[PDB]
Design a protein around this ligand. Structure first.
Ligand SMILES: Nc1nc(N)c(CCCN(C(=O)CSCC(=O)NCCCCOP(=O)(O)O)c2ccc(C(=O)N[C@@H](CCC(=O)O)C(=O)O)cc2)c(=O)[nH]1
Ligand SMILES: Nc1nc(N)c(CCCN(C(=O)CSCC(=O)NCCCCOP(=O)(O)O)c2ccc(C(=O)N[C@@H](CCC(=O)O)C(=O)O)cc2)c(=O)[nH]1
Lengths: 204, 193
């Protein structure tokens, strides 16, 4: 099945997805990669894997709606069964969200609200990452899987972040594979795995 | 003055034009780069230059027509004053050619022993035809190889195509009735010089 990934940066998560499609762990094909930043290194990961790229920059458009109308237009050329946001830094409008309702995924490095992340100030606790269906509740549509990342004394911000990214790379291919195998659906602003409704914090 | 460049491979010509816009030698801006091959190295030259990129692959389209319809559509998002074909390996349909009439430029490595050279011309529906604007003949001697010919023709491509684009940016070059006209003067079959 066809996966279209949207990025804005480095693309380490895109790459974990491409490799999981290479080793047949996801039953799918990344057909196109989309960026809102022209220098994004994720476009070079796509080029080397021979995947078609498109970059849509906001200044080039007249209105937010205009941008999303074209973004929809270009994504649909690849007949997506999922559209995966992997570090996509733009908010998607109501028309975009409803257009891909139930097959629009996102990963945020947080669990459900408190998380010692940033490093703008090792440590205590609360740190992680969750993959969730994207809804109009910005950053807060239904969670599918989360992963708590253990903090330790001898940890730096780069230690924590790298550890979070290592968990992002494990869970996002897992979720997209359950989606590709027909086991994950959204309805009633709830995530469903094998017909069972997931609790607010995902599986398990 | 907006430049959209269309490529299929290495992109050395694209690099020569980005370079000339930087140096204000071409008073214009490359606004986007289109490719019909996903792996094309010119896409990487565009990424580093910070230029928007779009790859349209033929297998994704159902027909020639559909493809060119999407190409026009995505190019016109960048309101091109000129569309520059710089190693783009696909024949553009009559409809596309019509749509960018007098605004579509191409470079091909043959003027139109040593028979070798390169020429820039306006694209008109006579494939490879359309009026020549500027050529450069490249002599070959015994000893230099086909690759050294290529390398010499390429040095010239990088000299004449930023130059035609420079004239087009300054409103000095126009196409009318299947003839190129620089400063009013009608260019002869072999272009300027
Ligand atoms: N409607 C809707 N739209 C969404 N996009 C979302 C997505 C969630 C909100 N979102 C994010 O959480 C950030 S991306 C997640 C993340 O941190 N990934 C890191 C790991 C992957 C990268 O690493 P690697 O590249 O290596 O894989 C986010 C954060 C900030 C802005 C924002 O205001 N952004 C802009 C405004 C942008 C605009 O709308 O034009 C601003 O003003 O700053 C927008 C969205 C949603 O839930 N609903
Ligand atoms: N209607 C129309 N369409 C055009 N696109 C053009 C322009 C292109 C015409 N053309 C060429 O000039 C070929 S020589 C180009 C070249 O390498 N220049 C030097 C710079 C190199 C970059 O170097 P660097 O990347 O490093 O900058 C060309 C002719 C035929 C095929 C063809 O049959 N091509 C395909 C068919 C493709 C299709 O239509 O689907 C085939 O069967 O193989 C392909 C191209 C035109 O004049 N008329």
């Amino acid at each position: 099945m066809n996966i279209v990934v949207l990025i804005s940066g480095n693309g380490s998560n895109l790459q974990a997805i491409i490799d999981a499609c290479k080793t047949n762990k996801i039953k799918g094909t990344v057909r196109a990669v989309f960026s809102n930043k022209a220098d994004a290194f994720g476009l070079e990961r796509a080029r080397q894997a021979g995947i078609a790229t498109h970059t849509l920059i906001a200044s080039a458009f007249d209105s937010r709606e205009a941008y999303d109308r074209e973004l929809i237009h270009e994504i649909d050329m690849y007949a997506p069964d999922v559209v995966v946001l992997a570090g996509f830094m733009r908010i998607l409008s109501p028309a975009f969200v409803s257009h891909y309702a139930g097959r629009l995924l996102n990963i945020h490095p947080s669990l459900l609200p408190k998380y010692p992340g940033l490093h703008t100030h090792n440590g205590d606790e609360e740190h992680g990452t969750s993959v969730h269906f994207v809804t109009d509740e910005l950053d807060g549509g239904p969670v599918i899987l989360q992963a708590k990342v253990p903090v330790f004394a001898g940890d730096s911000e780069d230690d924590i972040t790298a550890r979070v990214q290592t968990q992002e790379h494990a869970i996002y291919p897992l979720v997209i594979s359950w989606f590709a195998d027909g086991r994950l659906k959204m309805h009633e602003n709830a995530a469903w795995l094998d017909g069972q409704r997931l609790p607010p914090q995902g599986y398990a």
